[PDB]
Design an enzyme around this catalytic site. Structure first.
Site, PDB file in Angstrom:
ATOM      1  CD  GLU A 118       2.101  10.383  -2.804  1.00  0.00           C
ATOM      2  OE1 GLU A 118       3.333  10.222  -2.633  1.00  0.00           O
ATOM      3  OE2 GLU A 118       1.303   9.443  -3.090  1.00  0.00           O
ATOM      4  CG  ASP A 134      -0.576   4.198  -6.027  1.00  0.00           C
ATOM      5  OD1 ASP A 134       0.383   3.492  -5.658  1.00  0.00           O
ATOM      6  OD2 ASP A 134      -1.413   4.676  -5.241  1.00  0.00           O
TER       7      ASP A 134
END
Length: 362
Positions: A118, A134
């Site tokens: 990210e 995640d």
């Protein structure tokens, strides 16, 4: 900060598959969602639907083994994905790009070996991370070349750390082993984070109940002090449990936020009964304290060092194990691992370039 900076992508995976790269996110100038190609040019997604419809192929060919490729990153907030062999399947809903959700057996990317980083590039610089919030899967290291020429990187596993994490998870009793997704022919794909373990039934909603009850008992009879602003050490909130509710008061004496006894999803996901929208900073502190199981031991939160993290028999073992196998001890093991600055993110205000290295499955 210029309109683009170069991202060098290096293939040190030791694997033979071709690599597919995706740079998916939101364009800063327009606020539109889409993808960027190797040159940094932006392509808005076409309109999506409900139910979601297929996205056009946004792949960029990645580096072959032993080599690097460069792409230009524009001012953009989003993700760099990489996949081995197979292309990813993305879909478009009314509001834009659908995130993959591989905790779902029917997710179209369930059987694909992939990961993402990210990042944000804007007028105030670059932020780029290594995340396991995640899942824990195909390993990678990210870096930034700063304005002054110095480099920072993070995300790198110790030697043997990839298999080390899986082996430790498999041996953790209680359901952690069912976090592992494994090609029915045995090869490991990824391990889901415990939030998604609760969702899939790998772990029970009650897994942290004994510890949570001990915390609630302790802070019925003594104060829990939260100082949730790292740069404002004098701003304190005092928590005490009464009537089964943890109530925080500020300096003025007002009750400013209250917490119900949390469950496993709330703790592992830093949400629900631990939602963090003055509540936000307080909740973030509590989230980290529950995942690291330091709340019982230390009534002055957040912790000032990591020495007492993850010592309880039931704790966030996924986070414990990942931090132990990271070369720099930092990781994004749960959403608020940035409490105490223990997260695998690097940043610079005047970046010259960035790097993503696909690491070996060691």
């Amino acid at each position: 900060v210029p309109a683009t900076i170069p991202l060098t992508i290096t293939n040190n995976s030791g694997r033979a598959e071709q690599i597919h790269i995706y740079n998916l996110g939101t364009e800063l100038s327009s606020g539109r969602q889409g993808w960027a190609d190797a040159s940094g040019a932006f392509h808005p997604w076409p309109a999506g639907g409900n139910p979601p419809t297929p996205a056009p192929d946004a792949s960029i060919p990645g580096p072959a083994p032993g080599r690097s490729t460069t792409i230009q990153i524009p001012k953009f907030s989003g993700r760099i994905y990489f996949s081995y062999g197979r292309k990813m399947e993305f879909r478009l809903t009314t509001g834009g790009l659908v995130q993959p959700a591989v905790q779902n057996p029917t997710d179209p990317n369930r059987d694909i070996l992939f990961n993402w980083s990210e990042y944000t590039l804007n007028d105030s610089g670059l932020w780029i991370n290594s995340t396991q919030v995640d899942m824990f899967s195909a390993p990678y290291t990210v870096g930034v070349r700063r304005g002054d020429g110095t480099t920072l990187s993070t995300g790198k596993l110790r030697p043997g750390g990839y298999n080390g994490v899986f082996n430790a998870l498999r041996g953790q009793s209680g359901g952690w082993a069912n976090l592992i997704q494994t090609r029915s022919d045995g090869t490991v794909l990824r391990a889901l984070s415990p939030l998604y373990g609760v969702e899939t039934g790998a772990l029970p909603a009650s897994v942290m109940d004994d510890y949570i009850n001990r915390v609630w008992n302790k802070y019925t009879g003594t104060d829990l002090i939260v100082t949730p602003f790292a740069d404002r050490p004098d701003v304190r909130y005092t928590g005490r449990v009464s009537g089964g509710v943890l109530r925080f008061t500020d300096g003025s004496g007002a009750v400013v936020t209250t917490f119900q006894k949390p469950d496993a999803s709330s703790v592992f996901g830093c949400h629900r009964l631990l939602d963090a929208p003055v509540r936000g900073p307080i909740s973030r502190t509590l989230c980290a304290g529950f995942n690291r199981t330091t709340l019982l031991a230390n009534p002055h939160q957040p912790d000032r060092s990591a020495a007492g993290f993850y010592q309880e028999p039931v704790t966030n073992h996924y986070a414990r194990i990942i931090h132990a196998h990271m070369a720099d001890g930092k990781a994004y093991g749960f959403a608020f691992d940035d409490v105490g600055h223990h997260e695998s993110l690097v940043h610079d205000g005047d970046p010259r370039g960035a790097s993503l290295t696909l690491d070996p499955f060691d």
